[PDB]
């Protein structure tokens, strides 16, 4: 934060893009009531999986959005969840790296 | 400090007067008078320099006080900036 240049700015931008990452509608997935800890104190069953995979619930699979934005547990759909105009093949909802 | 200059000027004047009076009866006083005039001019310049130094040091207390205040302010600013930069670099 003391000495900054064009190379330093490029390195900071690359580090930020590596660490943190026309409609671009962000699906504001709200805390689902069907969980396991402070949810319904129940184990993982077919009901919770079907509610998180078909309905808009970010329990296990993920809360699907409009415009065919199917966000399942391992669905790498080409959506536009980012803040840019690139609707490329985004990673899965889990994105386990 | 500044008294050494006046002492050296007085010693030089006395030495010039002694060297002029030692061989005054040998040659003409045309050069001895010029040497005495040069010594007097040097003594006057030294006394004027001492007076100027005294006039400058008359406000030396206030000068040093203001310099210390400015140095303390600059040191506080530099210390705050360095602490902020170190915290940012650490984070």
């Amino acid at each position: 934060l003391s000495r900054n240049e064009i190379i330093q700015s490029y390195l900071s931008r690359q580090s930020s893009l590596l660490s943190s990452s026309a409609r671009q509608p962000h699906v504001l997935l709200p805390l689902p009531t069907p969980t396991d800890l402070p949810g319904l104190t129940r184990e993982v069953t077919q009901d919770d999986l079907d509610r998180i995979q078909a309905q808009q619930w970010p329990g296990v699979n993920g809360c699907e959005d409009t415009q065919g934005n199917w966000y399942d547990w391992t669905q790498c759909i080409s959506l536009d969840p980012h803040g840019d105009d690139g609707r490329l093949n985004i990673l899965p909802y889990v994105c386990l790296d | 400090r500044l008294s050494t200059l006046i002492e050296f000027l007085l010693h030089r004047a006395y030495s010039e007067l002694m060297v002029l009076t030692d061989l005054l009866p040998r040659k003409s006083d045309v050069e001895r008078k010029i040497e005495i005039v040069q010594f007097a001019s040097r003594t006057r310049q030294l006394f004027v320099r001492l007076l100027a130094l005294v006039k400058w040091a008359n406000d030396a207390g206030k000068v040093e006080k203001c310099a210390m205040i400015s140095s303390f302010l600059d040191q506080q600013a530099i210390l705050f900036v360095d602490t902020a930069d170190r915290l940012a670099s650490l984070a």
């Binding site: 962000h26 504001l28 803040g83 | 400090r1 500044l2 008294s3 006046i6 002492e7 000027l9 007085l10 004047a13 006395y14 007067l17 002029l20 009076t21 001895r32 008078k33 005495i36 005039v37 010594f39 007097a40 001019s41 003594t43 006057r44 030294l46 006394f47 004027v48 001492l50 007076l51 100027a52 130094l53 005294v54 006039k55 400058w56 040091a57 008359n58 030396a60 207390g61 000068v63 040093e64 006080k65 310099a67 400015s70 600059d74 600013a77």
Partner: protein, 122 residues
């Protein structure tokens, strides 16, 4: 008051001695040496009075200040530091405005409650 008067008296004595030596020297040339010795004694008495009066004028500071320089460099450095501080304050204000704008944008985009609570009263 007394130091400036003594300095003016020494300067006047030096000028009188120089004017006397500029004329035809007929008496002994020891007058210039006597005037120089009197000036040296007056300077010594003034230094003793300044040392006994508990004046905040040390010998090292007085020698460094009398090295043929002035406080113009320090004044220019202070002015440059003030200008740099003003520029840094303006840049920080611009960065804070940009951060507030980005926070409001993220609030309107994803979630406004947490961003508003963090930007309003931290």
């Amino acid at each position: 008051h007394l130091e400036e008067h003594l300095e003016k008296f020494v300067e006047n004595i030096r000028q009188l001695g120089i004017i006397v030596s500029d004329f035809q020297p007929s008496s002994q040339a020891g007058l210039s040496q006597k005037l120089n010795f009197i000036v040296t004694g007056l300077q010594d008495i003034d230094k003793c009075r300044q040392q006994l009066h508990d004046i905040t004028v040390p010998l090292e500071v007085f020698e460094y200040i009398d090295q043929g320089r002035n406080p113009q460099l320090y004044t220019k450095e202070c002015l440059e530091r003030a200008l740099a501080k003003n520029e840094q304050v303006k840049g920080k204000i611009d960065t804070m405005k940009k951060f507030k704008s980005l926070l409001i944008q993220e609030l309107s985009k994803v979630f406004p409650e947490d961003m508003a609570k963090y930007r309003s009263i931290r």
